[PDB]
């Protein structure tokens, strides 16, 4: 049937319950390298607006404190026009947010996204997309991968090596079967800390819609889009589905 989504849409209502089980990938703390702090409220919201099956992604912007130049607090999650799939997501370009208020000296720290396959390393659609977005622009951009599954969410932060990037540049496209040249060693654990003592916020497209699944013709993947602070829409929000209200 067409209505695969109906079942998923009902599912996403209970997606808030997955946040009684929040797991963060941890290893030995190294003060020689960075630590990324993700405000807990942003996580809670970002899951609440995600799908159970289809990938959902955003950029993260943040900045260092004075106390420690290596503690990068994430301040803002910028949700942008995009077209999700199972196991991959097509994302529009790094947003221009320069002209918004309170954006004084934010760094683009990277991206954050859902997935339905728990791994210990960045996968091949991840590496393709990570290179697509950041290859020629900002190499240190991390990837925060969220493994979201019934019961729980599990966060995992990665850097990408230059071999990773190069390999990703080679792959303009990714197929289900080809799986050529891939390495789990392409990516490296990055230090992520979830904190509840700082609260971050969202920046959303000005049109308000971030989910161009049911509008896949109008999705401009190099679109010059506008943005504002604001509360992000849910994945199957009526506005992401003009078409279903036409049948009715």
């Amino acid at each position: 049937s067409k209505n695969e989504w109906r079942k998923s849409a009902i599912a996403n209502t209970l997606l808030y319950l997955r946040l009684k089980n929040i797991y963060v990938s941890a290893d030995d703390f190294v003060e020689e390298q960075n630590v990324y702090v993700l405000p807990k409220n942003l996580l809670k919201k970002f899951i609440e607006i995600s799908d159970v099956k289809i990938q959902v992604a955003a950029f993260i912007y943040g900045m260092s404190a004075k106390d420690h130049p290596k503690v990068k607090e994430i301040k803002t999650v910028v949700l942008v026009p995009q077209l999700g799939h199972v196991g991959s997501v097509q994302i529009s370009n790094i947003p221009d947010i320069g002209d918004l208020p309170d954006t004084e000296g934010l760094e683009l720290l990277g991206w954050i996204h859902t997935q339905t396959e728990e791994l210990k390393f960045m996968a091949a659609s991840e590496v393709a997309t990570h290179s697509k977005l950041f290859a020629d622009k900002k190499r240190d951009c991390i990837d925060i991968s969220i493994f979201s599954t019934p019961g729980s969410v599990s966060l995992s932060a990665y850097n990408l090596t230059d071999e990773g990037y190069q390999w990703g540049e080679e792959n303009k496209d990714i197929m289900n079967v080809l799986s050529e040249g891939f390495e789990p060693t392409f990516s490296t654990h990055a230090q992520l800390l979830l904190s509840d003592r700082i609260t971050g916020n969202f920046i959303i497209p000005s049109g308000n819609v971030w989910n161009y699944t049911f509008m896949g013709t109008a999705f401009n993947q190099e679109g010059d889009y506008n943005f504002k602070y604001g509360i992000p829409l849910e994945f199957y929000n009526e506005m992401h589905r003009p078409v279903h209200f036409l049948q009715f």
């Binding site: 609260t199 049109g207 604001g230 009526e238 209200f245 009715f248």
Partner: protein, 1707 residues
């Protein structure tokens, strides 16, 4: 169980094969003991009300009822046959009700006093009566309106109307509204039609309505007349009891009295199965139709559905052709057919036409409006023989037929989810069509039904089915609503209420039916009542609609119960909404919860429709978790359909869906209301849409061009597919551009117009931290649409929320109602919100502030509210505790003479801790204590200990010139003698005079403004420099605005002057409890040990503070419901023998509240004065102001600004003794210390028609009122505050924890800086920043920079801020030519334009404004306008409805306001009242005050005007001076000279004209015998006339030009002027009857050339001597002859001025 129906004589039964029919003959004529009342016997106005009834007289029933109806005022119940003529009966009672208001002699008809309500069961009929009543009562010019079918706030208006025609439910919701209590009072006639509905399951609505009119009226005391209109049915007896009809007014009409008597017939179909049963009725129907046709009679067939009409009509058509078809086609083929077949063609569209050709019509709704009107009119005209109807015909139309057949009586109840039998009232409505009263000899009614039912419908049509109460079924819901209306608190209120129900009247009378336990034990069912009430209350408590304690017996009202009542929601449904609605509730869930509503309990998915339903359930836009088995899925899918307007085939289901939308609205709203209360951002936001979606019958995801009814169907479709954002289309401001996006030209110009009519807002919002925990948000909004009345209605409302960053937590909300006068112009909102602890420690990045149209899709506008640079202030340090001992005693102060003064021998607990520091030391001290702690005695110490050390001089400073006046005299009698010290008051209004008082006076009392104005030239004034002590009282008011700033400017200067002169000046600051005295005390220079500052709870007399919030009251000052509680508190004071005073925001409100208090006191046992009425009349005799006499008499005092002191003291004394129990006091008179036991502040809002809004009281304004409560012995005083919910939080908080005292100095810095510059205290720029460091502002911007607007927030940031603050200011100052800067780092020097501002106290902004508005050509009327715009007058009030009066006043005054400016401004008030002053018009006490306060401000301003114009060399400066005089004397320049003389009335003036006395000198000259005849005046009046006339000046003016022979053009020539009086004057104190302030005589020497309109020179002088002379200096004009003129012009008297013309030649 068998209850056989008695049939009238002549009844009989025929047995037919298909159905047993049974027949009831038309009844015989009654005994004729009446005359049909011809209309012409009606009084002559009425007669119109009955234009062209065919009869021209009332029918039998109407005629018999006419006496009691129209000549009686008794309550009435009329039971009558179907179709008896109810309208005219209702009409008679209407006309009577009108009669009680209009005067029989007067042509004029009062319209505001009476409200008439007509309750009627169905909208079809409600509308019908509205049309009929409008037509008929047109001539009397009264409005008849259907009481509004949908909305609530727009009901407050519809009291534009005099006749309200409602359904029971709409009038139940209206009247159950706490705010509508105002208007229920005017309801004098309550007509309930179809009163036998009582028996229906809707009938309890009628019970609740009546129970409320009788039982809940209370204090208001006058019940409206009630007229019930009924069907003749058993228990009418009990019904008339239920609505308190006495025998005079009860009527019951037998079937004999039905005009056009009715014959009945009951076909009892017997066939079991559906196919054959349906056939049975068709045949049965055909026969009866045939019979009626064979007798030349017409016939109406009622069927259950709209499709039935057309199929029944067709069966007939065909069955008639199957045999004949001649019979109904036409009366005659020749006569009818061309007239029919013309008309048959023209408007007929459907299959209806092939029926109409056959002479049979169909008639239902959802049929073309023209198409059904043809049917009615063709049938009316004989051309159709048979109209086949749905039931609406029966309520809507007036279309009779001889015969009426009900086919079938099966109806579908969507409510009950099931098929059912016709209700009795439907059958009786239907049968009221039978029989044309004018034409037909009789009428016929045929019911067709299953035999089972026949017995039942027999009883109904034959007066034997009893009317019985269903009040229990709806008992829980209806009880809650009275609990919510606050009329029930304890369950005795509940068992009384129940006594006014029909249930009760009916239980007493048939206790077995209602299952009473034992009436003989229970008596009048007191235990039964109590038991019902109990069980009801418990199920309510169980569901959280109430709070109940059985043991205690307290009933309490929940917020949730309050929604249930207001939105008319079933208690069970409120339960479901309670449990199910969540912080994480979702769209998909809402639809479910909606569908869970009790209202939809019975909805079932029937087998047949299930296949179609599944089709829709799988195309459903919002997922449905529930099965297609489940009922919830149906309700859900149905509601989703309504939003998509889906076409439905099944009738069953289409009825179902209709049932849903008519409830969907107010259920979804109740859901919204709960989520908003509970804070849940996301479901609240979503619910608001569903609400929109159910109004607009469309979904969110649709561009709202579809929402304009007035858009074409194609244009939207192209824009919806084109995916361009909705808002995107809105941005374009060009009419061509909008058309290019559409891709159509002509639609592009019309849609541009529509676009501009789409609502939009602009919002800005900054935030101000008040404390750490409390943030204030200041919002500025512009509404940007162009109003259209058809498209927007009277208003468009707007939800405003401030929500957390997640967008899940509503932190504040408020609803904004935009109206056509509001769009386009900016406004401001402010509110506080208390940050949660989390956010207090780490501020979040931002909050959000959002505005959403309640009505208009995609008109949401939200903005982030940053906290980027912010410092929350550090938490309050604890207040300095009190050592426990009251030890100090007046004996402790050394001197014996001093001890006599204080008249209390022991010092206060608080006074004791201070006493040491105040009396012993000469240390500067700061005291912070609550009002009523006797800080005045603290001032007096400092004074005693000043003089005990033989010191020089002291100044006492208070803002309240009212307090200064009291406290002068108190001090002056007590302290005058303590060494021979002279204590004087300073009146501000003449600085020179004040200067002189300083020199005379040992102690001065002054206001911050007054003294600050004196003190500015201290460098020159040695008497200020030599000042030894200064008491700053109520110093907490430096906070309080421009004048607060001036208080701080003042206090800073004394420090700067002490510091500069190494002069030791004692500063004693008396003040309220501050929150943080450290900064304040430090700024005043007080050692940390001398800064006593106490908690507000410290005040010694114990005092309890009860604060009560109230809904929807922000809108106004106080509402009926609050007033009631005020009165309960005042009664509670009266019962405890305690005295209570009540605080009100105006004088009007004092009068209006008194009037309610008299009415309320009459309707209680306690109406006592507590004293005899003959003794009070000697007192009231004084009657200074008649308005006070009437209330005072009943035990109630009034205190407003402007009373006669007679009034004042006469009222105070009567309270003082204990004659009058209750005092009512203007917010203004709160200053007057008038102590009591209990205080009620009734409302906490002030209207200013400057910002056209209500504003809440400041905590000061409260503290000045809370400080009136005191205790007797141990007894604790009580205070009652009556506020809006939003305000309660702020008031409660800061009445216990002081409001931080910040600085208003940024707002007057221009004047401040320009001033200290002018007096050479500042000559550099560093000086300006140094200067700041002596301010309180300075100390405050470091501790709370964010409050001031400092983004940087760091000591560098702040320091930068300040320097930019001076620079910005200095810029403005040079740019407006107040100062110049020049190299010596640099020297700053004042120009004249700013030196004149420094000299008169007049603002920087005002001078600026004058310089631009003034010209060499300025008229007097102009200078008056210019004047009225001075920024000084912004303090002058604009009360509710002053523009109204002001306009009317405008009409009587000489000068029209420059029309090119607004009518609302204070500039307007100022403009006129100064004319009302010049034209000596009597003004209301409120404009008297306004004028006084206006006059305080004017002498500075007019002198500024004269000094501007003159500086610019212009000679119209003199027509300013004319104005200066007019101001002092209360006259025009044009007026007769004598008029200025005090007390010279027209009669005295007219005698002066007979004698040919013309001028004031003629009056000095008058002979004694002429004096004694003209001056008819009191010894005192003459005193002034004396005073005036002696003082009046006569001055001789002479000059000498230094060398008048050697005049060279361009040199500085000097002239010497000399001024000679007759005798050196006593003093220059001005005498003026009209000016209320002191004024020194001053004079302008003017030199100028008249021909050229040009002033060459000027000097201001005072002629304090028998002779004087002065030298002027002026530039000689061009060579030639020049006619020069000198003028000597006084500023305080008319006609006293002298002038001298000469000529000169220049070489």
């Amino acid at each position: 169980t068998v209850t056989k129906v008695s049939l009238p004589e002549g009844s009989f039964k025929r047995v037919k094969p298909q159905y047993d029919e049974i027949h009831i003959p038309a009844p015989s004529k009654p005994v004729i003991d009446y005359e049909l009342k011809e209309i012409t016997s009606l009084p002559d106005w009425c007669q119109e009300a009955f234009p062209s009834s065919e009869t021209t007289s009332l029918n039998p029933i109407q005629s018999k009822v006419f006496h009691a109806a129209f000549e009686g005022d008794s309550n009435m119940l009329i039971c009558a046959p179907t179709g008896s003529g109810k309208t005219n009966i209702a009409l008679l009672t209407v006309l009577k009700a009108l009669s009680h208001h209009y005067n029989p002699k007067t042509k004029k008809l009062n319209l505001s006093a009476f409200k008439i309500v007509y309750i009627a069961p169905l909208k079809a009929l409600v509308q019908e009566q509205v049309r009929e009543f409008q037509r008929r009562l047109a001539f009397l010019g009264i409005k008849v309106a259907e009481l509004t079918g949908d909305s609530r706030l727009s009901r407050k208006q519809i009291d534009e109307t005099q006749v309200l025609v409602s359904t029971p439910e709409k009038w139940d919701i209206t009247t159950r509204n706490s705010n509508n209590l105002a208007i229920v009072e005017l309801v004098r006639l309550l007509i309930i039609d179809e009163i036998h509905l009582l028996h229906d399951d809707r009938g309890p609505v009628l019970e609740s309505i009546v129970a409320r009119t009788f039982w809940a009226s209370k204090y208001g005391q006058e019940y409206p007349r009630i007229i019930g209109l009924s069907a003749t049915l058993p228990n009418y007896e009990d019904v008339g009891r239920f609505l308190r009809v006495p025998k005079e007014g009860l009527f019951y009409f037998d079937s004999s009295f039905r005009p056009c008597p009715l014959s009945q017939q009951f076909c009892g179909i017997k066939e079991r199965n559906s196919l054959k049963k349906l056939k049975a009725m068709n045949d049965a129907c055909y026969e009866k139709v045939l019979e009626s046709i064979n007798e030349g009679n017409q016939i109406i067939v009622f069927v259950h559905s709209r499709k039935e009409t057309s199929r029944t009509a067709t069966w007939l058509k065909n069955k008639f052709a199957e045999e004949n078809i001649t019979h109904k086609l036409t009366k005659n083929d020749a006569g009818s057919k061309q007239i029919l077949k013309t008309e048959a063609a023209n408007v007929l569209d459907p299959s209806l036409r092939k029926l109409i050709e056959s002479g049979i019509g169909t008639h239902h709704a959802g049929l073309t409006r023209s198409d059904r009107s043809l049917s009615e009119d063709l049938f009316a005209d004989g051309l159709l023989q048979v109209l086949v109807c749905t039931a609406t015909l029966a309520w809507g139309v007036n279309l009779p037929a001889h015969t009426v057949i009900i086919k079938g009586t099966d109806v579908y109840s969507p409510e009950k989810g099931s098929w059912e039998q016709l209700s009795p009232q439907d059958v009786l409505q239907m049968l009221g069509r039978a029989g044309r009263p004018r034409y037909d000899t009789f009428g016929e009614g045929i019911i067709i039904t299953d035999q089972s039912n026949v017995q039942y419908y027999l009883s109904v049509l034959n007066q034997q089915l009893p009317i019985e109460s269903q009040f229990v079924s709806k008992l829980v819901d209806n009880l809650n609503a009275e609990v919510v209306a606050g009329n029930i608190k304890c369950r005795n209120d509940a068992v009384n209420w129940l006594a006014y129900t029909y249930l009760y009247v009916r239980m007493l009378a048939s206790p077995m039916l209602y299952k009473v336990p034992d009436i003989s034990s229970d008596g009048q069912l007191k235990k039964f009542r109590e038991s019902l009430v109990h069980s009801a209350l418990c199920i309510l408590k169980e569901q959280e609609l109430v709070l109940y304690d059985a043991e205690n017996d307290v009933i309490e009202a929940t917020d949730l119960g309050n929604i249930a009542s207001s939105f008319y929601i079933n208690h069970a449904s409120m339960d479901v909404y309670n449990r199910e609605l969540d912080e994480h509730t979702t769209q998909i869930d809402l639809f479910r919860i909606f569908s869970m509503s009790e209202e939809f309990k019975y909805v079932s998915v029937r087998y047949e429709e299930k296949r179609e339903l599944k089709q829709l359930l799988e195309k459903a836009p919002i997922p449905i978790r529930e099965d297609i088995d489940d009922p919830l899925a149906k309700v859900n899918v149905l509601l989703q359909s309504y939003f998509s307007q889906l076409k439905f085939e099944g009738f069953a289901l289409n009825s179902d869906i209709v049932f849903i939308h008519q409830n969907a609205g107010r259920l979804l709203r109740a859901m919204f209301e709960i989520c908003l209360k509970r804070g849940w951002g996301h479901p609240t936001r979503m619910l608001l849409n569903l609400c929109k979606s159910a109004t607009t019958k469309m979904w969110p995801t649709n561009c709202p061009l579809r929402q304009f009814k007035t858009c074409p169907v194609e244009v939207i479709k192209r824009l919806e597919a084109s995916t361009v954002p909705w808002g995107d289309y809105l941005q374009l401001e060009t009419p061509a551009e909008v058309g290019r996006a559409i891709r159509s030209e002509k639609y592009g110009k019309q849609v541009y117009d529509l676009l501009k009519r789409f609502p939009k807002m602009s919002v800005t919002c900054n935030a101000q931290p008040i404390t750490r925990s409390v943030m204030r948000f200041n919002i500025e909004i512009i509404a940007d649409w162009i109003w259209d009345m058809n498209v927007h209605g009277s208003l468009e409302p707007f939800l405003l929320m401030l929500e957390d960053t997640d967008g899940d937590s509503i932190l504040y909300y408020d609803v904004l109602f935009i109206t056509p006068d509001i769009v386009g112009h900016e406004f401001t909102l402010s509110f506080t919100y208390e940050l949660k602890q989390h956010n207090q420690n780490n501020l979040p990045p931002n909050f959000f502030l959002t505005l959403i149209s309640e009505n208009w899709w995609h008109s949401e506008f939200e903005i982030p509210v940053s906290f980027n640079g912010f410092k929350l202030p550090k938490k309050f340090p604890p207040p300095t505790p009190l050592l426990e001992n009251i030890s100090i005693s007046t004996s402790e102060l050394g001197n014996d003479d001093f001890s006599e003064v204080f008249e209390f021998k022991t010092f206060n607990k608080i006074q004791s801790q201070v006493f040491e520091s105040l009396y012993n030391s000469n240390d500067s001290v700061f005291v912070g204590s609550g009002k009523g702690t006797g800080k005045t005695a603290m001032a007096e110490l400092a004074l005693l200990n000043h003089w005990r050390q033989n010191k020089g001089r002291a100044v006492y400073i208070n803002p309240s010139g009212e307090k200064i006046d009291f406290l002068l005299s108190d001090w002056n009698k007590r302290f005058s003698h303590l060494a021979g010290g002279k204590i004087i008051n300073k009146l501000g209004n003449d600085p020179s005079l004040n200067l002189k008082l300083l020199a005379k006076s040992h102690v001065l009392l002054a206001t911050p403004v007054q003294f600050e104005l004196l003190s500015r030239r201290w460098r020159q004034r040695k008497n200020i420099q030599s000042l030894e002590l200064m008491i700053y009282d109520d110093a907490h008011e430096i906070s309080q605005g421009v004048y607060g700033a001036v208080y701080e400017t003042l206090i800073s200067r004394m420090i700067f002057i002490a510091t500069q002169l190494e002069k030791k000046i004692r500063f004693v600051c008396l003040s309220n409890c501050l929150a943080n005295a450290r900064d304040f005390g430090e700024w005043a220079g007080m050692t940390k040990s001398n800064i006593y500052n106490f908690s507000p709870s410290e005040r010694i007399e114990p005092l309890e503070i009860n604060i009560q919030s109230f809904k929807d009251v922000e809108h106004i000052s106080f509402n009926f419901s609050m007033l009631q509680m005020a009165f309960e508190a005042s009664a509670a004071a009266a019962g405890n023998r305690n005295s209570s005073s009540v605080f009100l925001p105006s004088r009007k409100d004092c009068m209006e509240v008194a009037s309610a208090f008299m009415k309320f006191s009459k309707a209680i046992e306690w109406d006592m004065l507590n004293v005899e009425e003959e003794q009070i009349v000697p007192y009231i005799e004084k009657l200074t102001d008649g308005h006070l006499r009437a209330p005072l008499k009943h035990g109630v005092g009034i205190l407003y600004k402007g009373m006669a002191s007679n009034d004042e003291r006469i009222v105070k004394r009567l309270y003082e003794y204990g004659a009058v129990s209750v005092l009512l006091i203007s917010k203004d008179c709160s200053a007057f210390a008038c102590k009591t036991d209990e205080v009620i502040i009734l409302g906490t809002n002030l209207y200013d028609g400057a910002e056209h809004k209500y504003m809440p009281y400041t905590i000061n304004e409260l503290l000045e009122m809370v400080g009136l409560a005191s205790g007797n012995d141990s007894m604790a005083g009580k205070v009652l505050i009556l506020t809006s919910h939003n305000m309660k939080a702020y008031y409660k908080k800061f009445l216990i924890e002081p409001l931080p005292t910040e600085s208003y100095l940024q707002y007057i810095i221009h004047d401040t800086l320009n001033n200290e510059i002018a007096n050479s205290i500042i000559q550099s720029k560093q000086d300006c920043v140094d200067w700041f460091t002596y301010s309180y502002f300075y100390r405050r911007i470091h501790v709370n920079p964010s409050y001031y607007g400092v983004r940087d927030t760091s000591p560098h940031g702040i320091s930068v801020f300040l320097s930019n603050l001076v620079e910005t200011c200095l810029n403005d100052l040079v740019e407006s030519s107040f100062i110049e800067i020049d190299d010596t780092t640099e020297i700053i020097s004042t120009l004249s334009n700013g030196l004149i501002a420094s000299h008169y106290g007049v603002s920087f902004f005002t001078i600026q404004s004058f310089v631009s508005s003034l010209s060499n050509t300025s008229t007097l009327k102009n200078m008056l306008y210019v004047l009225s715009t001075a920024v000084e007058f912004e303090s002058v009030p604009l009360r509710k409805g002053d523009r109204a009066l002001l306009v009317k006043l405008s009409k009587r005054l000489p000068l029209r306001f420059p029309e090119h400016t607004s009518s609302g401004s204070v500039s307007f008030k100022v403009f006129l009242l100064l004319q009302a002053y010049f034209s000596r018009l009597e003004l209301p006490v409120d404009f008297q005050n306004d004028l006084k306060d206006i006059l305080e401000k004017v002498v500075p301003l007019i002198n500024v005007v004269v000094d501007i114009l003159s500086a610019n060399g212009y000679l119209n400066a003199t027509t300013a001076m004319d104005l200066a005089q007019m101001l002092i004397q209360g006259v025009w320049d044009v007026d007769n000279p004598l008029r200025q003389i005090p007390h010279f009335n027209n009669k005295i003036l007219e005698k002066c004209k007979e004698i040919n006395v013309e001028t004031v000198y003629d009056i000095m000259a008058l002979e004694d015998e002429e004096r004694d005849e003209i001056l008819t005046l009191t010894d005192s009046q003459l005193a002034q006339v004396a005073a005036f006339v002696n003082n009046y000046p006569n001055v001789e003016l002479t000059y000498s030009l230094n060398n008048s022979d050697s005049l060279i053009s361009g040199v500085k020539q000097k002239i010497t002027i000399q001024l000679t009086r007759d005798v050196e004057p006593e003093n220059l104190q001005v005498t003026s009857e009209k000016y209320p302030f002191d004024k020194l005589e001053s004079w302008w020497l003017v030199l100028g050339e008249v021909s050229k309109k040009e002033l060459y020179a000027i000097k201001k002088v005072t002629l304090n001597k028998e002779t004087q002379q002065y030298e002027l200096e002026f530039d000689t004009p061009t060579s030639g002859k020049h006619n020069l003129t000198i003028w000597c012009v006084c500023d305080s008297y008319l006609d006293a001025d002298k002038e001298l013309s000469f000529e000169i030649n220049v070489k």
